[PDB]
């Protein structure tokens, strides 16, 4: 009985400390009770810090955090102290601005110290909870309940008189900022890092995940809920709309803007370069850029959604029986091989297809579908576009959406370039030491802001694309490409997905800058497609089909971007690329040749030797070879697997898939890749009234491709009946007959 005795004495001591911090001053008679500090209360703040140090850190326990959380130290002690300090300092600043050296604080240093210690406890207690492997069983047991207590913390921070603690935190930051750059000690810049970390804790708190034990078999009741919410906390309090509202009301956005825009001239950038990027990522991990531009209007889209629902409901009730359930109708169908098969239904009486769909659906044997089990959640990472569903939408309001649009616009127009340059300065030396979290957030920050500036420049001509021009430096090229390559070779798949998104948006930015101006563009397209990266982008779709839907959609968008940026050089032929030479490329140099090159391009001979070596590995690639390398059967397998989810996707992704199917089936002219039966079943499902809408623009090119596909199919089967077997099975590899199977000789 040592464990529960230690737990109850620890809870008793935290209860005594929480009573010893302060009181609401019920002795004074004010209609709101003003919070009064207790006697010897700064020592209590140091005791909470000492308890969180000695127990929570080295001993690998989280009992102190819940012992604090159940006694409401953050809710009832730290926040009233910080808000009282904020209100008193604001009133004193007003009275000192009107008349200086009148009505001072009695003990301002004490109040500043206890405010700083309260902010330290806010950062230390709202830290993001990650539970990796080999951790203690106490943390594994306590993780979900501590995530719920952190959700209560985020709601209480954002909701207490619209978040005056954010104003307290920025006041603690401008205590540092008012000091000159030369007179600032590193402790003051560490206080600035504390404030930026507090804002990243406020943004970064998200609802937890529901973990189940799979040792026992799942019963017949199954999962009834996956809700992981505290009682008073709803999904609206946690959501980003309240974050944007509380940040705009308390001028957090102007604080972040004025530290981002003067990061190099005013602040020591190495202290706050990483928490600033973490803050930007924690805004932009769950925001889609297409939904931020909306292009009675809510009722307009509502009326269109009810028309779509009415058409789908009509197509559903076509299959629904007109009579009741007990009105028994039995139908015996025969094949031309004489047999009797019985189905039970009323709608299935008249049409053959509903009856055959009944006969397919009456079976109770289901094949195994193996699952990856979503191992991304095992790593310590937030929910983002790599984890959310493709159909997930963030529902910004008018004012919150306008404030977020203004903040992101001023961020890009002020200091996206300086922040990106500072981060790619820092990470290019810390590349081999960063864990997956910084790689994922760097690639997502880069890709999100590049995509948002691309979309803003496409929508409006007032914005300049050169505001993300520092995305196009060689250092960011090297960093993104090396991150993607190191993610692939170590078989890390989250960073591979983030780098795939970043490379797709990098190619989109290069294509936009090339279409704008027709130069350094040939240099950078030679730089990205150098080394073995064409083979990397070629074999990324071959391994796509095993992983999740978002990985496969990124494979779609990356391969579409690769083929679009490489089809621009089909006639221009400018495809000189640094390649990796394998066997001996040694050449006996000639110093006369070296000196005449020195006269030619005005070079020193050491870097001319470098140029002479680098000219030997230069090769040229064929775009037809790039297409024919992309036409492997697992690429078609993963694209057919992506087209299976055609209900969830929008028009753009299936437009990309059918554009690549036009590339396979019309241009490249080998057609046996698409002569498989899963595509035929999927095309029947898409062209049915239950599938794609007739008013949607997707069904037009789906129908056109299916018409041309069945025309070539009937041509191939009329010329050769043996392909009646070939639709069932994967294509054949024997060289004596495989040419006739693939091309028809």
């Amino acid at each position: 009985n040592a464990a529960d005795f230690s737990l109850t004495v620890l809870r008793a001591r935290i209860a005594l400390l929480a009573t010893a911090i302060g009181g609401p001053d019920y002795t004074s008679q004010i209609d709101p009770p003003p919070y009064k500090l207790g006697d010897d209360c700064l020592a209590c703040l140091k005791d909470l810090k000492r308890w969180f140090k000695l127990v929570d850190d080295q001993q690998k326990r989280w009992d102190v955090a819940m012992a604090v959380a159940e006694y409401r130290i953050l809710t009832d002690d730290l926040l009233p102290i910080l808000i009282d300090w904020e209100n008193k300092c604001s009133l004193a600043a007003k009275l000192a601005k009107n008349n200086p050296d009148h009505e001072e604080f009695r003990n301002k240093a004490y109040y500043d110290k206890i405010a700083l210690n309260c902010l330290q406890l806010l950062v230390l207690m709202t830290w993001p909870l990650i539970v990796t492997e080999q951790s203690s069983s106490n943390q594994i047991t306590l993780y979900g309940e501590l995530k719920k207590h952190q959700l209560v913390y985020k709601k209480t921070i954002l909701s207490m008189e619209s978040g005056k603690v954010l104003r307290a935190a920025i006041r603690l930051a401008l205590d540092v900022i008012k000091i000159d750059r030369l007179s600032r000690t590193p402790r003051d810049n560490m206080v600035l890092k504390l404030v930026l970390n507090f804002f990243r804790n406020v943004i970064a708190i998200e609802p937890g995940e529901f973990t189940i034990n799979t040792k026992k078999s799942m019963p017949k009741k199954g999962i009834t809920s996956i809700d992981t919410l505290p009682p008073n906390v709803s999904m609206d309090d946690i959501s980003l709309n309240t974050v944007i509202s509380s940040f705009h009301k308390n001028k957090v956005f102007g604080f972040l803007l004025t530290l981002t825009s003067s990061l190099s001239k005013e602040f020591d950038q190495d202290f706050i370069n990483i928490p600033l990027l973490e803050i930007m990522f924690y805004f932009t991990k769950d925001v889609n850029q297409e939904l931020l531009f909306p292009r009675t209007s809510a009722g307009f889209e509502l009326s269109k959604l009810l028309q779509k629902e009415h058409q789908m409901r009509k197509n559903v009730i076509k299959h629904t029986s007109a009579r009741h359930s007990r009105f028994g109708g039995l139908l015996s169908i025969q094949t031309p091989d004489k047999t009797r098969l019985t189905v039970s239904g009323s709608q299935a009486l008249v049409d053959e297809k509903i009856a055959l769909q009944k006969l397919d659906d009456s079976k109770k044997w289901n094949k195994r579908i193996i699952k990856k089990h979503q191992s991304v959640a095992a790593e310590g990472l937030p929910n983002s576009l790599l984890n959310s569903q493709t159909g997930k939408a963030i529902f910004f309001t008018e004012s919150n959406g306008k404030h977020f649009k203004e903040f992101i616009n001023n961020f890009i127009d002020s200091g996206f370039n300086i922040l990106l340059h500072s981060v790619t300065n820092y990470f290019t030396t810390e590349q081999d030491r960063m864990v997956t979290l910084e790689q994922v957030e760097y690639l997502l920050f880069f890709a999100w802001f590049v995509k948002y500036q691309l979309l803003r420049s496409k929508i409006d001509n007032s914005a300049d694309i050169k505001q993300v021009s520092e995305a196009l430096k060689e250092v960011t090229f090297i960093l993104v490409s090396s991150l993607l390559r190191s993610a692939y070779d170590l078989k890390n798949w989250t960073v591979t997905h983030a780098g795939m998104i970043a490379f797709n948006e990098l190619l989109n930015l290069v294509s936009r800058t090339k279409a704008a101006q027709e130069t350094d563009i040939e240099f950078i397209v030679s730089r990205l497609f150098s080394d073995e990266r064409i083979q990397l982008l070629s074999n990324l779709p071959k391994i796509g089909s095993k992983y999740s839907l978002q990985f496969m959609k990124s494979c779609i968008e990356l391969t579409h971007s690769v083929l679009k940026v490489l089809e621009q050089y089909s006639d221009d032929k400018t495809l000189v690329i640094e390649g990796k030479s394998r066997r001996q490329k040694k050449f006996n140099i000639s110093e006369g040749d070296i000196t005449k090159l020195i006269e030619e391009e005005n070079v020193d001979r050491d870097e001319a030797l470098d140029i002479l070596t680098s000219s030997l590995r230069s090769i040229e690639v064929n775009f037809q070879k790039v297409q024919a390398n992309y036409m492997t059967e697992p690429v078609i397998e993963t694209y057919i697997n992506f087209l299976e989810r055609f209900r969830e996707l929008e028009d753009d992704s299936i437009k990309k898939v059918f554009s690549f199917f036009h590339r396979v089936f019309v241009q490249a002219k080998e057609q046996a890749l698409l002569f498989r039966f899963d595509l035929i079943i999927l095309l029947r499902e898409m062209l049915s009234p239950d599938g794609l809408d007739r008013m949607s623009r997707s069904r037009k090119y789906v129908s056109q491709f299916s018409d041309y596909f069945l025309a070539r199919l009937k041509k191939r089967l009329k010329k050769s009946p043996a392909w009646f077997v070939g639709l069932l099975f994967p294509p054949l590899h024997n060289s004596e007959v495989g040419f006739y199977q693939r091309y028809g000789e």
């Binding site: 001028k251 102007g254 004025t258 825009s261 003067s262 005013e266 001023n410 002020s414």
Partner: peptide
């Protein structure tokens, strides 16, 4: 579009004064 820190201090003090 450079954002000044002294402008942020002035806006902080002014919105402390009247808040508009």
């Amino acid at each position: 579009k450079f954002f000044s820190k002294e402008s942020f201090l002035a806006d902080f003090d002014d919105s402390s004064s009247n808040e508009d």
